[PDB]
Amino acid sequence: AIVALVVAIIIAIVVWSIV
């Protein structure tokens, strides 16, 4: 896993979302 996904998934979503 949750940390990896959340971290990566988040960073991506946040980053990709921003953007």
From Swiss-Prot:
The chain crosses the membrane at residues 1-19. It comes from the Viruses. It is found in: Host membrane. Phosphorylated by host CK2. This phosphorylation is necessary for interaction with human BTRC and degradation of CD4. The N-terminus and transmembrane domains are required for self-oligomerization and proper virion budding, whereas the cytoplasmic domain is required for CD4 degradation. The cytoplasmic domain is composed of 2 amphipathic alpha helix that form a U-shape. Homopentamer. Interacts with host CD4 and BRTC; these interactions induce proteasomal degradation of CD4. Interacts with host BST2; this interaction leads to the degradation of host BST2. Interacts with host FBXW11. Interacts with host AP1M1; this interaction plays a role in the mistrafficking and subsequent degradation of host BST2. Interacts with host RANBP2; this interaction allows Vpu to down-regulate host BLM sumoylation. Enhances virion budding by targeting host CD4 and Tetherin/BST2 to proteasome degradation. Degradation of CD4 prevents any unwanted premature interactions between viral Env and its host receptor CD4 in the endoplasmic reticulum. Degradation of antiretroviral protein Tetherin/BST2 is important for virion budding, as BST2 tethers new viral particles to the host cell membrane. Mechanistically, Vpu bridges either CD4 or BST2 to BTRC, a substrate recognition subunit of the Skp1/Cullin/F-box protein E3 ubiquitin ligase, induces their ubiquitination and subsequent proteasomal degradation. HIV-1 lineages are divided in three main groups, M (for Major), O (for Outlier), and N (for New, or Non-M, Non-O). The vast majority of strains found worldwide belong to the group M. Group O seems to be endemic to and largely confined to Cameroon and neighboring countries in West Central Africa, where these viruses represent a small minority of HIV-1 strains. The group N is represented by a limited number of isolates from Cameroonian persons. The group M is further subdivided in 9 clades or subtypes (A to D, F to H, J and K). Belongs to the HIV-1 VPU protein family. This is Protein Vpu. It comes from Human immunodeficiency virus type 1 group M subtype B (isolate LW123) (HIV-1).
